[PDB]
C-alpha cells in the first residue's frame, strides 16, 4: 500500500546507496529527478490497482466488465414487458365497421405503438377489448455455407426494445420453429435448438449448434428472427384517441377512444447491480431447482414487481406448527407479498407459474397467507438549532417511510430471491447516517419477533411520536 | 492539447471494448488473403517491435499490432527469432480502429 | 522486469556512461519494487492453481455469500474451490454429500441410509416407528409392509476415527447441501 | 504480396498436385499456361491464347516476317497478361536443321 | 435487412482529403474523381457536397443508375496532414447532369435531408420543454446543448420544413446552430465570448510555431449587418398590455410572442469580420475559436490592430482538386 | 491523463521544472526530449500490459487460443490434438536371411523426411505381405523427483507439445514401473489412487500435475517420472505406389526387405481454430452424459437407448388419480412404461434399468416398471372407387398405407424423437382416408374401440383383421 | 447482384414471353434484307457457336443467336459444317431486346 512519501524515501535510499550518483552529482541535479520519478511511479501504481480491482466480478466498477463476466457464466437478463390496459369504446361513426378484427395496429397521440390482443365484439353500441404496447418487426439472414455455429446478432436498437424472440428456419418450402435450450444439455445430432447470449456490447444473439450436439442450418436456407418490440414504461391516463394505422381504412369508419383502465403495467430492463448479483447466483442455480433458494429465484424471475418470497420444506413446518403429518411429505410452502396485488391474486399467479418449473415430480405446492405486524418507535433528540424543527421532523418521517416501510426494498435489497429481516441495529445506524441529530435516543414499541417464514414486520411512521427540542 | 495518432488502438477508451478490435485484427493476421505480407523477425528485432513496425509500414505507432500477432502480452518479453508473421495493410487496421471507435457494432449485425 | 532490460535499450555510446546506466537501473528497480507485483497478480488469475493466496481469498469470499465454508477444514484451498464448483453440478444426489464428508473430515468414508416406515397407518402412527436401511432386514417391528420416507440417517465406522463434534460439523457445513424436502435424523455408528 | 497458384496442368508430385508459393514462381505458372493454349481453344473467352503457330514455316535466318510476328506476339502478351513484367524476345536456331527456339524473359 | 460488413483489403491507397466513395457495397475508382467541394455552414442549412466525376464510357449514370434518391457512402479525413481527423458520412443525391463526358453530382447530408422535408401533417407541441421537441423532430442526431432554460409552445404547419421550428428555438434561446459529423449543436452566445482559443494563425511570420495564412480579406462593413437588427421590439399580451424590450432611441417594430426572455434575445447575432484561405486544415469546424496575429509586410513591421485577437469560425469550405487541398473560412465576432 | 503520449510527459516535466536556477535554462533542448521519451517507454509498457492482461483474463474476451485453453478447467475435448494418417503398404523380401516375421512398430522414413511406423505384425508367406502404417513416431522425456510437494508439475517443451498425440506417464519407484491413469477433475479420487491432471500453460506447453496427499498420491521423494509422447503431423499425404520407405533405426533390415505403399496415406486431421475451441470450452459437458439434467427422464431414455418408439414417466399424484385411491405404497416412486418395436418387455426393463443405473441416482427415489397393455382396434369401410381403378389394387394400397400410418410399429406416436406420447383419435382416420383420392364416398365404423389413458395403454390398428367392402360405382 | 450483359436473351425472365423475341429474331434471320451478312460454318466451329459469335460480331454473349439460326435446341448437338447462315447486326438485336424488355407489345399493335 505505497504512498508518495514511501516512494520518495525508497528512491532517496536507492540514490544514497549508489556509488556514482551519490558521489559525483549532488543536490541540484538529483532533486527534480526525484519528484519526476516518484510522480510517474505513483501514477503507474494507481492504474495497476484500478485494473486489478476491475478484474473480478464482485469488485467491478464499470458495466462492460460485469457484462463480460456475465457472458462467461452464461446469463441473459430479464427483458422489458409491455404495459397493458383496456379499451371499452370502439363505437363506429358511419356504417359497415370492422365487425370483429384482431391485432389491429394503433398509434396514440405520441407516435407510440399499441395493438389489440383479442377480437372485439360486434359493437352493437360499444365493444370492449384489451391492448398492449407490442409491435412486430422481423429480420432475415440467408445461409451461404455451414459455419458449424452460425451465430446471429441483432442491432443495439432492436435489442434495447425487445420482449420475445422466435426463430424460424425455411428449407425447400417448409418453415418450422426451433425451440430454445439451456446450453446443450440433452440434445444431439438432429435436434433443432439454439442458445441465447448477451455480448459485452448491448447486443443479443442466437447461436445454433454443432454437428454432434445439434443440427447445422443446412445450406441454401433462410433464417427468420421475429422480435416483439415494446417501450418500457409509459402510462396513458384516459380519454385519449387511438387512431388505427396501416389498416387506416377504419379511421373514417371507426372511432377508438381510451377508456376505463390506464395502460400502466410497464417494466424496464435490469440495472447494473441487479445483474451483478443475479449473474453471481446463476453459477450455483444452474437450471435445477432442488435447493430451497432455487424456488424463490425462479418465482422472482418469472413474476415482475414481487417483493420477497420464502420457501420452507416439511421439516421446518413440522418443527413450527405440527409434530407429525403424512400429508406434509413432499410438500413445499410459499409466502410472498405484492404491493399492487391482493393475496388471492398472488395465490393465482404463483401456482400457475410453478406449472413450468424444472425438476417437477412428486411435489405438491401450498401457499400460506402472510400476517402483518405494525411496529413503532419513539425518538428524543436535539438539533443544532440551525435548522427548523418542523422541517427536520418531515424529512425524517419521509426518509424512515421510504427506508423501512411496507413497500420498501429493504426485504430484498437486490432482486435476487431472498428474505431479509429488520434488526434493531439497522435503525440505529440509519437514523445516524442522516446526521440531523447531535444526540438522539430510540425506544421500540409494539415490536414482535418474526418467524422468518410468514411473519411480516414493516414500520408504521404515522403512529410513531417524535420528541425534538433545542 | 495533445491528441492521438489515428493508428493507435488507444482511441477506444475502454480496455474491454477494445477486445472486439483486437479479435478482428488477430483473426485477420492468421488468415491467408492475397493482400498479406510475410515478414520474418530479424536478429536485431527481438526486443524492438517499433523497429519492425517502422521497417514494414513506415509508421512507428503500429507496434501494438506486432506485439499482438506474436502472441505476447508485454513488450519486455523477447520474440523468437525466425518466427513467421503475416501483417495486413495499414488502411484496413486504421478503418478497423475507427469502426469500433465509432460504429463499434460487430461485423454481421442485422439491422432494419 | 528481467535483470538488465531497461539498461540494455540504450545506445551503445550511452551504455558506457556511468550515470545514465545507473539511472536506468534505478528506474527499473523502482518499477520492479512498486508496480510489477500487481501486474503479475493480474496476469496469474487465469487458472485456479496459479493464483496467489489473496486472489484465492477473494474467490472464496465470492463463493461464501451462498454457502457456509471454512477453508482451514480441508487440506488445500484450490481443491476446495474446484471440488465445490464441480459438485454444484451434482445437486441432489449422494455424490456431493459423500465427497464433501470425505474431503472436509480428513478421510472418513460414509454411506447414506434411508428410513422406512410401516404402511399400516391406523395402527402405527407415521412418526413413532422409523427404521434405517441396515436394520430394516434385521428387525421385528411394524409387523407389516413398508414404504420409503423422505428421511435419512448417516452410518459411520468406528475404526475410521467424537460423535458430538462430528454432528456439529455436519449441521454447520454439510446440511446446507441437502434438498429442502429431505429430513436428516441423527447419526449411526458401527 | 501473398499470391499462390496450382500447376495449370495438374502435375503429379509425391504430395499430390504441385503448388507454387511465391511472387516470382506465380508469374512462371501464369506464363506456363500461356504458350500452352492456342487462341480460341478456351471454351469461354475466345480471345485469349498464343500466336506461336505463325512461326512454323519460315527461314531460320533474319527476315521481315519475324520482325512482323514479334510485334503481334508482344502486343497480344500485353493484352492478355498486363501485370507480369516482360523484358524481351529472342528467336534463333537450335539443335538440328529444322528446330527453332523462342524464349520469353520475365525480369 | 441491412448487414454491417468489414472493409475490404483491396483498398491500399491513401489520399489527401477524399479517401473513398462507394454506392452500397461497390466502389467507384478514386482516380476517376477530379473534383470535390465540401461545405460546412454555420446555420441549419446542412453540410453539402459536390463531386465531378470523369465518365467517358457512360458508366456512372448509364449502368450504375445515379439519380434522385441514390445514397453515397463517403469517407473524408486527413490522417497525415495538418489535422489528423477521420470520419464517415452518408449523402443523398438530388440531381446529376452529364456534360462533356463528365458528371456533376449534387448531394445533401442524409440526417439533415430528413429534416428538410415538408410536413404532410401538422404537429403542435403545447407547453413542452425544448429538449423533447428537438428529440422528436430529429431522432437520429446526438444533442449538444447548454442554453435551454424555460418551456414554451411551438407550431409546425402543413408544408413547412422542420428546420423552421429549430431555428425559432435557436432565436428564442439565443444560441448558434449547426449540424455536422453526427451531432446537432446549440451553443449560447454569451458564453462563446469568454472561450479560450485552441489554434494560432499568423501572417508574415516565418518562425511561427502555429500555422500560416496565405490570403485574407478585411471587411469593414459592420453597418451592413447591424442595419437589420436596429429596432425596438414590441408585442401585445392580453394580461399585461403592450410589452417593450430593447433600446430607447430606436424605431419600434412589432412581433407576436409576448415573452420577455424571447424578446430580449431577438437581436443577438455574430458579426463577420474576416475571410481567409489556408493550406487545407481538416480540423476547422464552425464554433472553433482561434487566435490571429497579422504583421505588415512593408514600412516597419507594425501589427495590424484592426483585426481582433480572438475570432470565431462561422463557415468552412474544403476543396480538393487533383493536385492540391485547400480550405476557406469566414470569421466573426459576437455583438 | 490516462493515455500517456510523449508530448504529455514532456509537458509535465516542463511544468515541474520551471522556477529553478539550474533546470529552467534547458527547457527547450534535445537532452530533455530524449530523457522524457526514454522514460515514457516504461509508462507505455506498464499501461499496455495492464490493458492486455485485463482483456485476456476472461474466456469471453480472450484473443488467443492458448489463453482460452489455460482458462478452461477440462482439457479432454476443450482442446483437440493432431491425429495421424494411415494407409496400406506391401513388404517385398529380397535375398535370403530376411526375417520370417516383421516386428511390430518398425520405423520408416519416406523420400520426404517424415517419419512412418507400421502397426500390427506382418508375416511373409512367400516374400509378400500387407500391413497398416500410421505416420507417428515415439519420443521420450525424463524427469527426477528432487523434492515432493503439493501439486508437482512437469512441463513439456513447445516443439513436443506442437505434435503431441498421446500422453502416457510411467513413474518408477525402486524396481517397479507402473502406469498412472488420468482423471478429469480428480473425480472419485482419494489416497492410494494414482491419478494426474493435464493443464495448458499460457505459453504453448502441455503439463502434468499430481496433487495433494488426500486427493491423490504424491510420487515419492526418490523416484523418476518419465513422459512418453507419440508425435505426428496431421495433414501430410503420400501418393499410392510411388513411395519407397527405407527402414530407419532398424537398418539391419534395410538391405533385406523392400517396402512400397499401395494406397494413399491420407485422412489426417489438425488442431482446431480459436473460435471452435472457445465455443467447445463453454459447452463441454454436452458431449458426455453425466447426470439427468433438469429431471427429464424421457429425453434421457430416448437419447441413450435408440429406437424406443415411445415412453412415459409417472408421478405420485398421477398414479393416485389413476387408481382412485389415496395410497397403497406409492410415495417416493418413479414409474415408467414404454414400447420397443423389436424387443421384449423384460429386455426393455433390463436395458432401461441399466441405463438409469449408469448415472448417479436421485436421493430416496426408486424406479419401477409397468408393462404395457395392448388394445388393438379394427375398422370397416364401405365405399365406391369408380370404374377407372380396380378393386384389388385399391384394397392392397389401402392396407399398406393404413399399416404405415397407424400401426404397432408406426411412427405416429412419436414423429419427432423428443419424448412425447401421441394417441390416435377418431378424426385422424377419417382425415387420412379422405386425403387419398380413391373413394368417391365412404362410411367408417369402428369395431373394438377403447378409450386409453396416456400412461400405460396401447391402442393401434390391425389392418389384416379389418374387413373392407368396396364396390364399383 | 450479378449484372447480365445487355446482349443476353435471359434479360427477359419468363421463358414463354421470350418466345416472341425469339420468333422475331428467327423471322428476320430467314428474310432477304439488304444489310445481312452471309457466314459459312468453318470446320473448327462445329461444336462452338461462341467462336462464330466472336468472329462475326466481336461479342461472345451473342451465341444464342447463332444457336437459334442454325436450328438446334441443344448446344452439344453439332452443326452441319458448311451450312449457310444469315445473321443481322448487333444494334438491331439490342434495340429489339430493349423494346421487348421495357414495352413488351407485338410489333403490329394498334393503340389510340
Amino acid at each position: 500500500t505505497p504512498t508518495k512519501d514511501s516512494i520518495r524515501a525508497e528512491f532517496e535510499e536507492l540514490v544514497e546507496k549508489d556509488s556514482f550518483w551519490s558521489k559525483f552529482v549532488g543536490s541540484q541535479f538529483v532533486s527534480m529527478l526525484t519528484l519526476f520519478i516518484t510522480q510517474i511511479v505513483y501514477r503507474c501504481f494507481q492504474y495497476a490497482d484500478a485494473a486489478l480491482a476491475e478484474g473480478f466480478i464482485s469488485t467491478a466498477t464499470r458495466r462492460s466488465s460485469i457484462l463480460a463476466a456475465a457472458e462467461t457464466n452464461s446469463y441473459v437478463g430479464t427483458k422489458p414487458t409491455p404495459s397493458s390496459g383496456m379499451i371499452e369504446i370502439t363505437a363506429t361513426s358511419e356504417d359497415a365497421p370492422a365487425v370483429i378484427p384482431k391485432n389491429m395496429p394503433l398509434i396514440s397521440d405520441d407516435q407510440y405503438p399499441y395493438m389489440t390482443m383479442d377480437v372485439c365484439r360486434l359493437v352493437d353500441g360499444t365493444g370492449t377489448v384489451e391492448v398492449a404496447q407490442l409491435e412486430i418487426q422481423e429480420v432475415t439472414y440467408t445461409v451461404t455455407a455451414a459455419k458449424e455455429f452460425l451465430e446471429v446478432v441483432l442491432s443495439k436498437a432492436l435489442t434495447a426494445v425487445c420482449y420475445k424472440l422466435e426463430v424460424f428456419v425455411t428449407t425447400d418450402g417448409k418453415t418450422t420453429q426451433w425451440s430454445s435450450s439451456t446450453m446443450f444439455r440433452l440434445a444431439g445430432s438432429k435436434s433443432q435448438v439454439y442458445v441465447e447470449f448477451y455480448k459485452p456490447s448491448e447486443q443479443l444473439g442466437v447461436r445454433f449448434g454443432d454437428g454432434l450436439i445439434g443440427q447445422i442450418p443446412p445450406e441454401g436456407s433462410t433464417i427468420t428472427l421475429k422480435v416483439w418490440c415494446t417501450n418500457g414504461d409509459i402510462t396513458l391516463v384516459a380519454g385519449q384517441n387511438l387512431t388505427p394505422v396501416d389498416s387506416a381504412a377504419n379511421l373514417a369508419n371507426l372511432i377508438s377512444v381510451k377508456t376505463t383502465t390506464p395502460i400502466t403495467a410497464g417494466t424496464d430492463a435490469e440495472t447494473t447491480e441487479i445483474t451483478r448479483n443475479r449473474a453471481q447466483y446463476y453459477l450455483a442455480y444452474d437450471d435445477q431447482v432442488v435447493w430451497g433458494g432455487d424456488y424463490t429465484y425462479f418465482l422472482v424471475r418469472n413474476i415482475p414487481g414481487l417483493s420477497w418470497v420464502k420457501a420452507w420444506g416439511e421439516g421446518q413446518q413440522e418443527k413450527l406448527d405440527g409434530a407429525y403429518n403424512v400429508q406434509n411429505i413432499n410438500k413445499i410452502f410459499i409466502s410472498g407479498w405484492h404491493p399492487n396485488k391482493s393475496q388471492s391474486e398472488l395465490e393465482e399467479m404463483i401456482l400457475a407459474a410453478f406449472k413450468k418449473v424444472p425438476n417437477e415430480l412428486n411435489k405438491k405446492f401450498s401457499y400460506k397467507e402472510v400476517r402483518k405486524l405494525p411496529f413503532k418507535i419513539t425518538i428524543t433528540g436535539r438539533i443544532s438549532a440551525s435548522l427548523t424543527i418542523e422541517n427536520v421532523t418531515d424529512e425524517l418521517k419521509s426518509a424512515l417511510e421510504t427506508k423501512f416501510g411496507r413497500d420498501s426494498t429493504f426485504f430484498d435489497p437486490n432482486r435476487v430471491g431472498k428474505y431479509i429481516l429488520i434488526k434493531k441495529k439497522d435503525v440505529w445506524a440509519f437514523i445516524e447516517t442522516l446526521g440531523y441529530f447531535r444526540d438522539f435516543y430510540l425506544e421500540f414499541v409494539e415490536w414482535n419477533e418474526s418467524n422468518g417464514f410468514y411473519d411480516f414486520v414493516y414500520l408504521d411512521t404515522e403512529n410513531s411520536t417524535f420528541n425534538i427540542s433545542y | 492539447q495533445y491528441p492521438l495518432s489515428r493508428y493507435d488502438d488507444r482511441n477506444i477508451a475502454d480496455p474491454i471494448l477494445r477486445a472486439e478490435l483486437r479479435k478482428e485484427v488477430m483473426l485477420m493476421c492468421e488468415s491467408n488473403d492475397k493482400n498479406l505480407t510475410i515478414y520474418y523477425v530479424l536478429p536485431d528485432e527481438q526486443y524492438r517491435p517499433d523497429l519492425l513496425a517502422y521497417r514494414m509500414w513506415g509508421i512507428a505507432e503500429l507496434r501494438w499490432v506486432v506485439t499482438l500477432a506474436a502472441g505476447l502480452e508485454d513488450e519486455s518479453q523477447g520474440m523468437t527469432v525466425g518466427k513467421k508473421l503475416k501483417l495486413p495493410p495499414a488502411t484496413w487496421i486504421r478503418e478497423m480502429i475507427r469502426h469500433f471507435q465509432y460504429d463499434g457494432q460487430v461485423i454481421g449485425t442485422l439491422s432494419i | 522486469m528481467q535483470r538488465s532490460w531497461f539498461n540494455h535499450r540504450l545506445t551503445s555510446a550511452k551504455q558506457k556512461s556511468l550515470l545514465y546506466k545507473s539511472l536506468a537501473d534505478l528506474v527499473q528497480s523502482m518499477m520492479d519494487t512498486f508496480v510489477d507485483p500487481w501486474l503479475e497478480r493480474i496476469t496469474n488469475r487465469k487458472s485456479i492453481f496459479s493464483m496467489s493466496k489473496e486472489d484465492l481469498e477473494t474467490r472464496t469470499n465470492e463463493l461464501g455469500q451462498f454457502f457456509t465454508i471454512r477453508t482451514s477444514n480441508s487440506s488445500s484451498v484450490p481443491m476446495l474451490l474446484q471440488q465445490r464448483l464441480d459438485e454444484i453440478h451434482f445437486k441432489g444426489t449422494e455424490r456431493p454429500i459423500n465427497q464433501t464428508i470425505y474431503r472436509e473430515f480428513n478421510g472418513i468414508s460414509v454411506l447414506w441410509d434411508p428410513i422406512y416406515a410401516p404402511v399400516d397407518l391406523e395402527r402405527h402412527p407415521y412418526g413413532t416407528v422409523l427404521i434405517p436401511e441396515s436394520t430394516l432386514e434385521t428387525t421385528g417391528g411394524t409387523f407389516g409392509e413398508m414404504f420409503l420416507t423422505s428421511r435419512g440417517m448417516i452410518s459411520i465406522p468406528i475404526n475410521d476415527l467424537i460423535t458430538e463434534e462430528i454432528l456439529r460439523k455436519f449441521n454447520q457445513f454439510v446440511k446446507p447441501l441437502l434438498p429442502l424436502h429431505i429430513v436428516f435424523d441423527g447419526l449411526t455408528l458401527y | 504480396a501473398n499470391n499462390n497458384e496450382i500447376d495449370p496442368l495438374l502435375t503429379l508430385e509425391l504430395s499430390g498436385v504441385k503448388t507454387y508459393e511465391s511472387q516470382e514462381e506465380a508469374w512462371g505458372a501464369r506464363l506456363y499456361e500461356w504458350l500452352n493454349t492456342y487462341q480460341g481453344e478456351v471454351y469461354g473467352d475466345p480471345s485469349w491464347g498464343n500466336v506461336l503457330p505463325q512461326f512454323k514455316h519460315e527461314p531460320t535466318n533474319l527476315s521481315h516476317v519475324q520482325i512482323a510476328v514479334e510485334a503481334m506476339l508482344l502486343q497480344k502478351l500485353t493484352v492478355d497478361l498486363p501485370d507480369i513484367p516482360i523484358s524481351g524476345l529472342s528467336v534463333a536456331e537450335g539443335d538440328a536443321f529444322d528446330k527453332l527456339k523462342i524464349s520469353i524473359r520475365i525480369r | 435487412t441491412k448487414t454491417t460488413t468489414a472493409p475490404e483489403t483491396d483498398s491500399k491507397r491513401t489520399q489527401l482529403f477524399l479517401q473513398s466513395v462507394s454506392i452500397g457495397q461497390n466502389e467507384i475508382p478514386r482516380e476517376m474523381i477530379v473534383g470535390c467541394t465540401y461545405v460546412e455552414p454555420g446555420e441549419l442549412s446542412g453540410p453539402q457536397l459536390m463531386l465531378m466525376i470523369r465518365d467517358s464510357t457512360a458508366y456512372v449514370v448509364n449502368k450504375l443508375g445515379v439519380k434522385f434518391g441514390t445514397i453515397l457512402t463517403v469517407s473524408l479525413g486527413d490522417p497525415e496532414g495538418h489535422g489528423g481527423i477521420l470520419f464517415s458520412e452518408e449523402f443523398f443525391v438530388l440531381k446529376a447532369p452529364r456534360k462533356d463526358d463528365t458528371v456533376l453530382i449534387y448531394a445533401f447530408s442524409n440526417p439533415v435531408r430528413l429534416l428538410k422535408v415538408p410536413s404532410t401533417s401538422a404537429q403542435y407541441f403545447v407547453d413542452k420543454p425544448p429538449s423533447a421537441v428537438v428529440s422528436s423532430l430529429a431522432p437520429g442526431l446526438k444533442v449538444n446543448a447548454d442554453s435551454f432554460r424555460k418551456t414554451s409552445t411551438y407550431h409546425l404547419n402543413v408544408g413547412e420544413k422542420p428546420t423552421k421550428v429549430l431555428q425559432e428555438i435557436a432565436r428564442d434561446t439565443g444560441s448558434m446552430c449547426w449540424a455536422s459529423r453526427g451531432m446537432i449543436n446549440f451553443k449560447s452566445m454569451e458564453k462563446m465570448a469568454n472561450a479560450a482559443p485552441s489554434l494560432t494563425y499568423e501572417s508574415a511570420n516565418p518562425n511561427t510555431s502555429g500555422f500560416t495564412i496565405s490570403q485574407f480579406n478585411i471587411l469593414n462593413a459592420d453597418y451592413e449587418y447591424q442595419r437589420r437588427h436596429n429596432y425596438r421590439m414590441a408585442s401585445y399580451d392580453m394580461t399585461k398590455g403592450v410589452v417593450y424590450s430593447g433600446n430607447q432611441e430606436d424605431p419600434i417594430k412589432f412581433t407576436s410572442n409576448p415573452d420577455p426572455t424571447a424578446l430580449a434575445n431577438y437581436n443577438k447575432f455574430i458579426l463577420p469580420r474576416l475571410d481567409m484561405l489556408v493550406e487545407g486544415n481538416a480540423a476547422l469546424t464552425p464554433g472553433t475559436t482561434l487566435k490571429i496575429v497579422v504583421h505588415n509586410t512593408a514600412g516597419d513591421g507594425e501589427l495590424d490592430e484592426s483585426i481582433p485577437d480572438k475570432m470565431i469560425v462561422m463557415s468552412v469550405t474544403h476543396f480538393e482538386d487533383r493536385f492540391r487541398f485547400v480550405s476557406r473560412a469566414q470569421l466573426g465576432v459576437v455583438n
Side-chain angles (χ1 to χ4, degrees), chain B residues 34-35 98 102 107-109 111, chain E residues 1-2 4 9-10 84 86 88:
Chain B
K34 60 179 180 180
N35 322 65
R98 162 222 155 242
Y102 303 151
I107 303 305
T109 35
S111 306
Chain E
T1 73
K2 184 173 162 175
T4 308
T9 45
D10 296 332
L86 195 83
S88 204

Side-chain angles (χ1 to χ4, degrees), chain E residues 13-27:
Chain E
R13 280 199 296 198
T14 311
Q15 316 279 336
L16 296 167
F17 180 63
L18 181 67
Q19 308 282 343
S20 90
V21 178
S22 314
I23 302 184
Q25 267 88 340
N26 298 326
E27 216 184 357

Side-chain angles (χ1 to χ4, degrees), chain C residues 127-162:
Chain C
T128 49
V129 198
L130 268 69
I131 311 172
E133 164 86 321
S134 63
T135 45
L136 178 102
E137 300 196 0
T138 59
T139 190
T142 74
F143 309 96
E145 201 186 359
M146 301 305 248
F147 61 86
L148 259 174
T149 51
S150 304
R151 304 210 155 204
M153 147 156 182
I154 271 180
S155 188
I156 301 179
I158 320 171
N159 198 3
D160 305 0
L161 281 177
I162 308 189

Side-chain angles (χ1 to χ4, degrees), chain C residues 15-27:
Chain C
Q15 282 181 60
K16 294 186 181 174
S17 93
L18 318 163
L19 303 176
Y20 249 100
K21 161 166 193 296
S22 292
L23 176 64
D25 277 347
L26 288 172
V27 178

Side-chain angles (χ1 to χ4, degrees), chain A residues 96-247:
Chain A
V99 49
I100 330 174
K102 195 219 168 190
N103 267 348
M104 219 188 333
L106 317 166
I107 218 73
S108 186
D109 321 77
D110 313 313
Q111 290 78 38
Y112 281 29
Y114 288 80
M115 102 184 156
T116 172
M117 217 75 199
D118 253 338
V119 299
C120 200
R121 188 256 185 297
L122 320 170
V123 194
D124 305 339
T126 38
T128 178
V129 86
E130 65 176 328
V131 284
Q133 216 198 148
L134 284 182
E135 199 204 350
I136 218 79
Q137 43 196 307
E138 316 163 4
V139 64
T140 176
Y141 172 73
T142 50
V143 180
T144 64
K147 217 187 59 185
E148 261 197 345
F149 277 104
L150 259 171
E151 59 182 29
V152 176
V153 179
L154 301 185
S155 165
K156 289 185 173 190
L158 275 169
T159 55
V161 285
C162 179
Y163 171 45
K164 294 173 184 172
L165 181 123
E166 302 186 359
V167 182
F168 303 86
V169 180
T170 285
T171 187
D172 293 359
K174 44 181 331 175
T175 206
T176 65
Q177 283 215 11
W178 286 36
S179 43
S180 50
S181 69
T182 318
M183 301 185 139
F184 296 105
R185 277 301 179 62
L186 265 191
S189 299
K190 86 271 183 177
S191 310
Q192 298 158 349
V193 289
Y194 67 90
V195 194
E196 297 189 15
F197 67 99
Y198 209 75
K199 283 283 198 179
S201 55
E202 310 153 359
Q203 291 167 1
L204 180 135
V206 159
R207 175 144 31 188
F208 291 92
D210 191 33
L212 299 161
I213 46 186
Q215 174 182 327
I216 319 184
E219 310 86 299
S221 74
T222 278
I223 316 178
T224 321
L225 268 54
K226 200 157 104 154
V227 194
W228 305 68
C229 301
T230 172
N231 312 351
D233 230 327
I234 54 189
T235 59
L236 271 163
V237 169
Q240 316 73 0
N241 233 43
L242 281 83
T243 56
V245 289
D246 188 2
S247 308

Side-chain angles (χ1 to χ4, degrees), chain A residues 238-421:
Chain A
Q240 316 73 0
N241 233 43
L242 281 83
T243 56
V245 289
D246 188 2
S247 308
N250 304 357
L251 179 51
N253 201 304
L254 281 160
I255 305 177
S256 298
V257 192
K258 160 59 49 175
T259 85
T260 63
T261 72
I263 319 290
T264 199
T267 309
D268 312 315
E270 307 174 347
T271 69
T272 318
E273 211 277 350
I274 300 172
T275 292
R276 156 146 55 181
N277 285 241
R278 278 170 168 180
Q280 261 200 308
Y281 184 61
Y282 187 86
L283 267 177
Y285 174 50
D286 279 349
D287 53 307
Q288 330 182 10
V289 304
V290 49
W291 283 326
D294 303 355
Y295 305 99
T296 85
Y297 184 60
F298 171 81
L299 287 177
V300 152
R301 294 209 71 181
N302 285 31
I303 312 175
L306 201 76
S307 277
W308 66 274
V309 154
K310 184 70 174 63
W312 67 87
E314 55 162 329
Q316 289 87 359
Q317 176 80 337
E318 101 180 2
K319 267 197 209 223
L320 174 135
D321 176 61
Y324 278 96
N325 206 12
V326 197
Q327 306 303 142
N328 283 356
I329 294 187
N330 295 9
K331 240 178 186 168
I332 306 308
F333 305 104
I334 312 279
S335 164
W337 167 267
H338 216 198
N340 329 294
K341 293 298 190 308
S342 85
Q343 294 276 325
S344 57
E345 288 161 349
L346 176 70
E347 167 66 289
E348 289 183 357
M349 309 212 197
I350 282 180
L351 294 206
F354 266 122
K355 204 74 71 163
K356 270 302 302 183
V357 82
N359 259 10
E360 62 96 12
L361 256 185
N362 321 69
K363 278 170 193 175
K364 315 191 251 182
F365 290 102
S366 312
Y367 180 85
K368 275 204 53 65
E369 289 65 22
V370 186
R371 43 176 331 186
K372 335 174 181 306
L373 313 174
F375 211 84
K376 228 193 308 297
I377 59 169
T378 36
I379 314 183
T380 56
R382 305 176 156 300
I383 329 172
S384 293
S386 183
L387 294 174
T388 59
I389 281 185
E390 210 201 30
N391 315 355
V392 167
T393 56
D394 288 0
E395 278 189 310
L396 183 50
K397 202 179 176 183
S398 44
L400 283 183
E401 186 40 50
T402 166
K403 167 83 171 178
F404 290 112
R406 207 174 49 191
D407 295 8
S408 71
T409 173
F410 173 85
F411 306 100
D412 225 5
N414 320 120
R415 286 325 208 94
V416 62
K418 207 155 298 181
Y419 195 12
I420 295 200
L421 319 171

